[PDB]
Design a protein around this ligand. Structure first.
Ligand code: SF4
Ligand code: SF4
Ligand code: SF4
Lengths: 439, 134, 292, 292, 439, 292, 134
């Protein structure tokens, strides 16, 4: 007997379920290009609160960034007669540097007032804190990986009498097998000293000064993306072409692995190329590798030497926005925007990045996207012969035409013995410092 | 794979067949081309055999497909057209012969055969294509 | 159709399609199916290009209409060095359905906005987005601590010619259409205009807008200026550009460089989340001040 | 390609595809398009199987690459009784593009991970997931009150051979490959290993891992053990298995049965939601204690 | 004139809108198999709070489980001079058993301290409470179906002076036409008595003891799934093959009907088979009904006797998680996980079930999924002839091969006179008690 | 199949498909593939219509089964003036698979519910939704301040015939099947029934339900009543309708017009969000009252 | 690419072939349309060669396809139909000759050939389409 209109049903499931197996987002997709599908990424956490449940995941972070933590092993309320507790707040995993500048619900509490005992969460397996001798040694937990902070005889008097939501500035050095080789500051320094001293003051040259207070924490972008693939298990990871400072990224547990990495591909713009099995992560530039003439393209599928698509004017992202973290002061969600002067009439396209970066840098990034997303309107769809197959999937083609000589970075190489390319328009001058003043 | 026999002797005029190649090709649209060959050899790919004799020859021919055939056996094939080289160019053929003397082991390119009766004793079948699997 | 129903209810009809697009520049272009050049308005529709007219769709919903409108590109026509450089972006069309026997018997099928143009193989294919393209987009301000408007905007009127602010000087040394030497660099501060409009009003790039960056004068008032993006048409080292001054969109740069701090349209103070859930501790500074 | 461009820029080229997959077991398999067995490394690529090589795709995005790689299964080859039992799962491939005239002229197209293998009709079709398969997965711990690690893990090192913990005894009475009699049951506690690794190192299932349950000794140290799942290859009632002990992943079972309570990597106390929004009532027990 | 590339547009809408008309999820889909599309199900409610709006839906539950309720008819604050109210909190619908152990915002309040009047919410139409004679008899509401709990002269003194979020342990017996036939404990007992008495103590044999305190509440799984189809209107429902105890499931109003049921198909694993118009709900086992040899399959569409798909190793759910409810103590969200020892390197796949179950049972369920989801990697896609059409859509096939003799449970039977099958690999030993110790 | 396996395991089989649908009205319809009219129950299956029987699908999941069941519409058959008016909506089917040689050798493939019927070109195509159609729908009450039940419902039983409440009078002046004059308007209040059931029990629209609005009597008890929607079948100005009274589903209209204020099944007071987050100010009215 | 030989001398009556032009075209539905070509030459695209001689000529012809052929080599082709210009218009041909005197290096447009036996000595093959790749 014949078939019904579940011919449309078997066309979907699993007719299209096989695809995504083997495979605000308003601005996330244009920056990766045709590329691949941009996974939902980094709904930035504002009002960081600590939930004491059992279903919250272990967070991870790299550098100076506040994290909420959560309660593990709180004793009963103790009335001195006007209360007292013994908390232990677990921040993040891995060996960390020390936790300074604790502030609870509200503005600020002085850490000298507290009796906190910070712990690195060392794989060395730090023993029991002995404040858990309330429980006793025989049931004292001895957390190996996670970096918990206990609190001792905490007076609940100044903040009500309820437990306040504590939030902790944490400094975590990037770890992993690629990180222990090639040591950056956080252990590479091996004794700096030279404290300038010589005592409201002269901090106008701090952004250009030789001294390294504050910014010694920030990990290079090379090892943090190496930490992601290390935790995911890819040790074949190649990352020598990366040049960036992270300064406090933070993704939670069960953040897909790649969706934590994909926020970095919007900020620093790097390729995630994978020429060979190395998965080369190179920083994206305009350095042209191909120099094709128009005479040197192959015969494509659609029988056009170069199909050139220019995207709609009604969707060009006239103004772009961020949701970065303040990273110098009290870590709070902020926003800058870049507005193109001719067409400001609409198309607001913003996204949220959960990392922490300064004020002139955020206006630099959004100034870079608004230029790039209007440059990346043009896409090219051509086929080039396997006589020059050394055009890796992330290279950029000069592509001489009779009218233009416009560069093109390429995506979605599908070859089978005929390299067919979905390029995208990329200029070299996009990837520069914006050189803006600071706050 | 067998070494059983050549074939029934009879082959009609029209037993066609010649070597193959995959040699996939891109045809660069604005100039010349470039093309690759993964073989270094050639499938001889003989076709269009015809048995034409009495019906006494037919029952030894229909079970030729069946008995030693099945699908997946040799039955070394006789060419009317140990390493043979071809020296008429300054290039070379240098194509091997696993079997002796042009015997090119093959298999039939058919799920079924189709023998016809043309008269009281005439037995005909129009085609039995082969490709010479190694 | 508008009172051609007498023509149309007869089976003998002769309505040949035709349309005009008005570019962002003042010129229009003409296109028709009729195979003979015809006009009713001062447009002179040419059958030399355009016009495959494939399947205009409709919908009571806010979703746009669409028509891919296959055609040809040529020297009289769009010519694609015009198209690639940045023109025809917000090009407005009207499609018509004229009677070629009498062009006073016509109507408009839709007035479109020509969103996506895909050119290739010596031809172009241009999706005609419908009247409702602007709906479906996000418009808003997000209380961010910068400004929010452009210089010419109604929310910050400036009178951008009011003094020696604009740099009217003709161009030399165009190089790779990002670097521009500019013979008359001298006349202004170093790094005066860092986010301005490089409107180029002569030559190849006629009326084309880019954005400046790196306003640096190297020697004797050279004023080498970069841009974010290519102009898409090469200036010919003789063109005239004018560059409006650069706004950092910040309160300090607003009031110092410009006088117009009144028309700010921005949100400088904006306390923060941690202020909001804070309860007032009775310690330290609790007197009235800036909170900055 | 790596310095075969001199070979490749000529239209006369001869690059025949070829690839090797390394199974989870130490053996590799060879595959080539060249129709003659060739090798460059110690792999001995066979054209008897594999190799249709359909359309490797790429992407700058984190999404994997793919190649379905149609081929044939045979006794020398994968043979599909090997494949169905649980091998070739995390099989690592490298696809090569060798010159058959000179195999020193080669490169790697990608190094894959061979995710989905669909076998049928006397053939197999095996999707080659790309290098970035591991990205796109969830990894994390959720503060749950059990442990979180396996016995061999770095977060809980154990020295799993340190005493008479492992049961090394050779197998008898395999039945339906879930029940296992085991001649040498005696030597351990009843229900000693309830979540352990039944690594079988001889015979048919060579180096195949299952998980135990129902460790019960019925008479004279029989130790009838179930498994969760079939091994997929039948053991032959003479194989040697070793079973690591069972961890309930709980603080009581941690410290009692095993000494390693220090390396816990778990979260035993974890107060709860109702504690968090609770305000302290000044009634009943409000002195410092376990809260348990 | 020709057609545009809305040929792709008319391919979707409504080209594929006709399909889903006639038709964390990371682990939900594998457990149902090829099966059908797993609807979003049971985001478990933590911090149960009561919202007094008009847009919250009527909840429903079956057995001992806390529910938030919401405010209906609160009088004005009354100052004794230090406040007093007259609340009425409506818990759930249907006739219930009594509400005990009320705890507000925070730990616990003693119900003897309250003046609450519980109501069953009887279809008998309970009269007015007479505390609503504040309103008067002429406007007193007299709620028929819903089971409200009034509160009388409630002192707002111990919890601030604001209204606290009240949460109520509710016991609700499973109802419906299939439930009144075949009575279980909750009315089947018809007088048990035999209180053991004979007076910290000996509760180590409570899980094995003959006495029925506490677990007398829990409804059999047969009638709760009968209550769902009864409320949905399917009275043709067949459920004699079900054997489970519910112990406090809870789905809200507008929970799709089936998505409330689909959480039970993950816990107890049952078929929802529908051989005939009865919609037979049988518990899933490995009991083989078919015994096909390889010689006895039909000629399929793809011209392969048995297409056998083995899923990707990179997606096998190496570790599985739950979000069950504590069900013995203070009802709180908890989590257990099962970790496969060889491949623990990744693929965490968890889901959230809103029902309440004990501690050894949760580790039993997650121990069952981690075994099943790795067993259900293999799927078979064959066609069997209508000579044996009595293979119902949920049966399991022995399927003798030359190499293996691996069982297969079947899904997605599409016949038209040629029964074509998408099976899935199912073993018998998966469906057993895990036999674990308790908390 | 139920014990026709002896018939079915033989290759010589003769099972011809056949099905019966029961409409919402008491009549059933018969359909068969056998090309000869046959019956086993009192249904008299006709091969004059129906019956293409395309590809019943199945699933262990809660998703429905489907069968499009192409056929023909005719005067004996569905006839499509019956179908368009509002019948065959919740029509229940059973598909059978009978042996035409012996109709006692049969089973049910599924019992369906016939969701979507698409008729066109002189034929009909009717998607047979499966047994599980009701699952997948939202059922609940949302604490809204009206009532929630219909008049006949168990949650508000009324005894709708208990007095002179229903208007039994025969119809005149049907006009455009929305306006209904009604000769016997007089007997009730003006605007008595505003949300009632216009069950029409005679003539063309037999047993068809509409909802009333605008119950107005213009002169001498005319009682001109509108409806929300067309009946879909024209009443013939002689039919008999009965109209149950109208419930505004409000506490005031409940207790005044009807006696049944006890069986309310509604939520009149329902304080509000602003009450919930309110803290008690010690000013003004803070004594016990209605809060209304 | 070779310079090996012309071909076997024999070519049957019917050896067809003429220049092939990309001629990318737009075909405006209005009326007249524009077009352009990116070659500035023309692939000569000869087809339908036939070898007809004795079986002594066949074994030097079947390995002509194989030995110096493969797929991807020259074998300069003889036309029965250094720069040649065509002056019969006031325009010009001006088409180059890389090889001398109408020798047009080509390749066969076939994955396989098909030689037939028509009698004790007759060797035939119906077609060998070429395209003169540069
Ligand atoms: S700084 Fe002043 S002129 Fe410039 S954008 Fe802001 S408000 Fe407008
Ligand atoms: S009980 Fe000890 S050895 Fe076992 S998994 Fe837990 S920490 Fe590791
Ligand atoms: S007003 Fe009374 S009779 Fe009418 S719907 Fe409401 S409860 Fe039922």
């Amino acid at each position: 007997a014949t078939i019904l209109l579940s011919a449309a049903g078997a066309a979907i499931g699993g007719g299209f379920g096989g695809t995504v197996l083997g495979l605000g987002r308003v601005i996330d997709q244009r920056l990766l290009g045709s590329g691949s599908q941009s996974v939902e990424t980094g709904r930035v956490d504002r009002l960081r609160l600590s939930s004491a449940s059992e279903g919250e995941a272990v967070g991870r972070l790299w550098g100076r960034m506040r994290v909420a933590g959560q309660v593990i092993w709180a004793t009963r309320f103790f009335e001195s007669a006007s209360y007292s507790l013994s908390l232990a707040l677990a921040l993040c995993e891995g060996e960390i540097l020390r936790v300074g500048r604790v502030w609870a619900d509200g503005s600020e509490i002085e850490v000298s007032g507290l009796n906190m005992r910070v712990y690195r969460g060392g794989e060395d397996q730090l023993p029991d804190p002995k404040i858990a001798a309330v429980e006793g040694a025989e049931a004292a937990p001895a957390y190996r990986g996670i970096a918990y902070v206990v609190l001792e005889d905490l007076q609940l008097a100044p903040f009500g009498n309820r437990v306040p939501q504590f939030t902790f500035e944490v400094v975590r050095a990037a770890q992993g097998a690629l990180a222990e080789a090639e040591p950056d500051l956080t252990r590479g320094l091996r004794a700096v000293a030279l404290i300038p001293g010589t005592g409201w003051s002269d901090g106008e040259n701090y952004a250009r000064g030789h001294w390294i207070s504050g910014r010694a924490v920030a990990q290079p972008l090379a090892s943090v993306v190496a930490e992601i693939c290390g935790a995911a298990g890819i040790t074949e990871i190649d990352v020598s072409g990366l040049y960036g400072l992270v300064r406090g990224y933070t993704m939670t547990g069960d953040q897909t692995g790649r969706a934590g990495l994909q926020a970095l591909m919007l900020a620093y713009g790097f390729e995630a190329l994978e020429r060979d099995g190395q998965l080369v992560f190179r920083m994206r530039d305009g350095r042209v590798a191909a120099d094709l003439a128009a005479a040197d393209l192959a015969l494509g599928e659609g029988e056009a030497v170069v199909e050139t698509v220019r995207a709609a004017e009604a969707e060009i992202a006239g103004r772009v926005r961020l949701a970065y973290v303040e990273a110098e002061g009290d870590f709070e969600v902020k926003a800058v925007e870049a507005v193109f002067p001719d067409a400001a009439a609409g198309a607001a396209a913003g996204s949220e990045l959960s990392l922490a970066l300064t004020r002139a840098q955020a206006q630099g990034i959004v100034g870079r996207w608004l230029a790039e997303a209007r440059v990346a309107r043009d896409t090219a769809r051509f086929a080039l012969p396997p006589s020059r197959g050394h055009l890796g999937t992330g290279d950029v083609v000069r592509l001489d035409l009779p009218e233009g000589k416009r560069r093109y970075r390429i995506d979605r190489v599908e070859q089978a013995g005929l390299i067919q390319v979905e390029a995208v328009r990329v200029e070299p001058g996009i990837y520069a410092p914006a050189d803006e003043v600071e706050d | 794979a067998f070494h059983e026999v050549r074939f029934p002797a009879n082959l009609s005029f029209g037993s066609v067949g010649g070597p193959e190649r995959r040699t996939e090709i891109v045809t660069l649209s604005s100039g010349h081309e470039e093309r690759n060959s993964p073989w270094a050899h050639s499938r001889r790919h003989y076709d269009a055999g015809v048995g034409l004799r009495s019906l006494d020859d037919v029952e030894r021919l229909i079970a030729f497909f069946e008995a030693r055939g099945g699908q997946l056996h040799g039955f070394r094939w006789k060419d009317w057209a140990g390493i043979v080289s071809f020296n008429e160019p300054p290039p070379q053929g240098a194509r091997v012969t696993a079997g002796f003397e042009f015997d090119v082991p093959v298999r039939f390119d058919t799920d079924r055969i189709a023998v016809s009766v043309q008269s009281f004793q005439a037995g005909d079948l129009p085609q039995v294509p082969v490709v010479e699997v190694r | 159709p508008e009172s051609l129903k007498a023509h149309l209810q007869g089976g003998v009809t002769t309505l040949a399609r035709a349309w005009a697009l008005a570019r962002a520049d003042g010129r229009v272009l003409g296109f028709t199916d009729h195979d003979v050049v015809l006009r009713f308005d001062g447009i002179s529709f040419e059958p030399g290009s355009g016009m495959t007219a494939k399947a205009v769709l409709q919908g009571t919903g806010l979703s746009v209409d669409n028509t891919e409108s296959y055609g040809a590109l040529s020297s009289e026509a769009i010519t694609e060095a015009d198209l690639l450089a940045g023109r025809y972006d917000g090009a407005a069309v009207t499609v018509w359905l004229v009677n070629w026997a009498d062009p006073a018997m016509r109507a408009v099928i839709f007035r479109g906005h020509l969103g996506e143009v895909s050119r290739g193989a010596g031809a172009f294919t241009a999706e005609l987005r419908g009247l409702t393209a602007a709906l479906g987009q996000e418009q808003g301000r997000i209380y961010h601590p910068r400004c929010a408007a452009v210089l010419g905007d109604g929310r910050c009127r400036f009178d951008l010619t009011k003094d020696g602010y604009a740099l009217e000087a003709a161009l030399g040394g165009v190089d790779e259409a990002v670097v521009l030497r500019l013979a008359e660099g001298a006349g202004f501060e170093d790094r005066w205009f860092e986010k301005g409009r490089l409107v180029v009003l002569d030559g190849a790039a006629a009326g084309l807008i880019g954005v400046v960056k790196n306003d640096r004068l190297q020697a004797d008032g050279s004023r080498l200026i970069e841009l974010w993006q290519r102009l898409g048409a090469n200036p010919v080292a003789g063109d005239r550009v004018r560059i409006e001054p650069g706004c950092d969109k910040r309160a300090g740069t607003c009031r110092l460089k410009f006088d117009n701090f009144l028309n700010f349209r921005g949100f400088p103070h904006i306390p923060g989340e941690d202020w909001m859930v804070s309860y007032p501790v009775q310690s330290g500074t609790n007197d009235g001040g800036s909170l900055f």
